């Protein structure tokens, strides 16, 4: 499962108070809501109660090395719970399968669906039944009357991706206090512009987000809070200037600003 263009809250995923096990490495579990990434990959599969210890970076056995290998740089987050009342039934529930035999090791995050009957001589015995040639995929032994170490546990792996893209799965920042009439910096999902936010008098059509001008500059944005149209105007205009009476006449000077709005006299040509 791939998560995209959706905001995610992980507080509801933790306050269930029904999961038996939770291992979540790489990122501190208390501070993963504010920190966000690009994509979230959800991998779901069933496993027995005695194999939940094998799912960890740096383990060797018969399930992890043949079905889903965990790399060293595993920032995924593993959640599992007991579901014996639904994943198993009387008379023998053998609907779920697993691979026990494999020719060699496999790369992490790789799926193996080859239904090729394995042998000690794996490479000659292909699709045929030969000496010591037994199908690598075998049935389970799920039963609702078992104990605790062999119950059907539903394991979900919530991994994260590190590549350049704007964060989609998790909202990098939440709604902050609204400030206007001051030169501030904003990131309204499409630009990082530094400027003031005045109250405009022009209404936008109810399908647009941004707004340009004759000079083709994004000077109008719609705030997604309660749909008010705010203009964008840069706060830094022009430069400074110095008035000097000259040599052998004075020592003091006057400072002039070109297009900056404010002893001090507000002239037409600035401050």
């Amino acid at each position, epitope marked *: 499962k791939r998560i995209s263009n959706c905001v995610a809250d992980y*507080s509801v995923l*933790y306050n269930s*108070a029904s999961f038996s096990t*939770f291992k979540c490495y790489g990122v501190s579990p208390t501070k993963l809501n504010d920190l966000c990434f690009t994509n979230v990959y959800a991998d779901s599969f069933v496993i027995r109660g005695d194999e939940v210890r094998q799912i960890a970076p740096g383990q060797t056995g018969k399930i992890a090395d043949y079905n889903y290998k965990l790399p060293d740089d595993f920032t995924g987050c593993v959640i599992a719970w007991n579901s014996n009342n639904l994943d198993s039934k009387v008379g023998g529930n053998y609907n779920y399968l697993y691979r026990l035999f494999r020719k060699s090791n496999l790369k992490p995050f790789e799926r193996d669906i080859s239904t090729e009957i394995y042998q000690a001589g794996s490479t000659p015995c292909n699709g045929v039944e030969g000496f010591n040639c037994y199908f690598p995929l075998q049935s389970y032994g799920f039963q609702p009357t078992n104990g605790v170490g062999y119950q059907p546990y539903r394991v979900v792996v919530l991994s994260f991706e590190l590549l350049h893209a704007p964060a989609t799965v998790c909202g990098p920042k939440k709604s902050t206090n609204l400030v206007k009439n001051k030169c501030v910096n904003f990131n309204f999902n499409g630009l990082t512009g530094t400027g003031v936010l005045t109250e405009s008098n022009k209404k936008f059509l109810p399908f647009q987000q941004f707004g340009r001008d004759i000079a083709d500059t994004t000077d109008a944005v719609r705030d997604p809070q309660t749909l008010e149209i705010l203009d964008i105007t840069p706060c830094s205009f022009g430069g400074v200037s110095v008035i000097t009476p000259g040599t052998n006449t004075s020592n003091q000077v006057a400072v002039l600003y070109q297009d900056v709005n404010c002893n001090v006299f507000q002239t037409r040509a600035g401050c």
Partner: antibody
Amino acid sequence: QVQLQESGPGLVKPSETLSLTCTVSGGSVSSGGYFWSWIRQPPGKGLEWIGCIYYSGSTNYNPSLKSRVTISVDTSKDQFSLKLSSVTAADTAVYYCARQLWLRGRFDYWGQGTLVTVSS
Amino acid sequence: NFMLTQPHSVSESPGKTVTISCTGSSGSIASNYVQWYQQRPGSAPTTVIYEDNQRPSGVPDRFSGSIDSSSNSASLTISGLKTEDEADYYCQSYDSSNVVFGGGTKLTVL
């Protein structure tokens, strides 16, 4: 930062109702999605978990202490209290109200331990 | 019925390295997070390490924890013993909606 202060008497008789209230100053009980729990520790023995609570009605108790722990949260006074029933002479322990965020995690801030000695 | 087995007495000279175990009976240690607590006599306990491999801000780098899920024993390796380490050590688990603590290790050299 934030701190937790316990109150209530340090005394209770056998088969009596215990009333220990832990108050919080410098923070909000309801805000932050923050859990609350109580931990007792007998002198010379290990820590024992009593129960944990949310700012809503969600709660859970130790099966050794099940059907005896009654903990309630009042947001207006910004504190939480625990009520213990059928207390005995073996319940003499140092009670700590425990500030904890992660239910599988840790008690990051500990309040000072009030001494409870059951008076026969 | 899940408990944490912890040695009662652990005594080594200052300056060396020690290992404190925390063994689970039924549930595997890799199933749930394990938190260690270092408590002075007559005061509130303080978390010395959490999340089984990383250290809280304030404690030295000597407090290291390791997980050995094969033997179901959680290890806390402490190196370079000194005067103010002489305290009780407790390990925590969660089981399933029921927080379970450890027996308790007294770190007294003599």
